[PDB]
Amino acid sequence: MSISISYSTTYSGWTVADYLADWSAYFGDDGSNTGGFNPGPFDGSQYALKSTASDAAFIAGGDLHYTLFSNPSHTLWGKLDSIALGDTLTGGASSGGYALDSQEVSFSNLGLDSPIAQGRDGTVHKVVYGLMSGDSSALQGQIDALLKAVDPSLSINSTFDQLAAAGVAHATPA
């Protein structure tokens, strides 16, 4: 039920805020590339998007819905459980899901749920739209609150190693 974070050892000494600001810049600052919905076509347990500026990519996990041209137009809503940040996006429905070949960091048990009615005002829309427009600030907001609810000493300014020491993060081989 609690937020769980996995991080490449490369990012051991980084704060979550510094890593997220850097990955957002990596992605760069509308469209879509080499990803999509799993299963799709306009709904998935996964929504995956590659940058048009770099190999940077993310996968949003949960029960997600894109309204397309239906009112409210161009809204991503539903349940957002997880965000996986990295590069070299691969796979699809056929491969049994999307994956990052280089998964740098992932956030699980985000517990976000936005209804269709809130349109592009929905937290899920803002969090994911943020990542796509090189602004990770909404995501940081939600992580920061999730960390504080486990342990009020923890923040987006905790290093990954500090969050591992507090039982919410686990390192993966680099």
Could you tell me the two tokens for 162?
């500090």
Q: Which two tokens stand for residue 86?
A: 């990295």
How was this structure determined? It was done by X-ray
Is there a binding annotation on residue 120? yes
Six-digit token pair at 167?
Answer: 């039982």
* Domain boundary assignment for the chain: 1-174
CA 12 to centroid of chain Cα atoms: 19
b vs e for 69-96, b when ≥16 Cβ sit within 10 Å of the residue's Cβ?
Answer: eeeeeebbbbbbbbbbbbbebebbbeee
Question: CB under 8 Å to 39, separation ≥6 — which residues?
Answer: 45, 93
Residue 11 assigned ligand-binding role: no
66 is an annotated ligand-binding site residue: yes
In sequence order, what are the residues at sequence separation of 6 or more whose Cβ sits closer than 8 angstroms to the Cβ of residue 18? none
Is residue 26 annotated as involved in ligand binding? no
| 10: number of Cβ within 10 Å | 16
Q: What are phi and psi of 96, to 5 degrees?
A: 85, 5
* Tokens matching residue 159: 């290093």
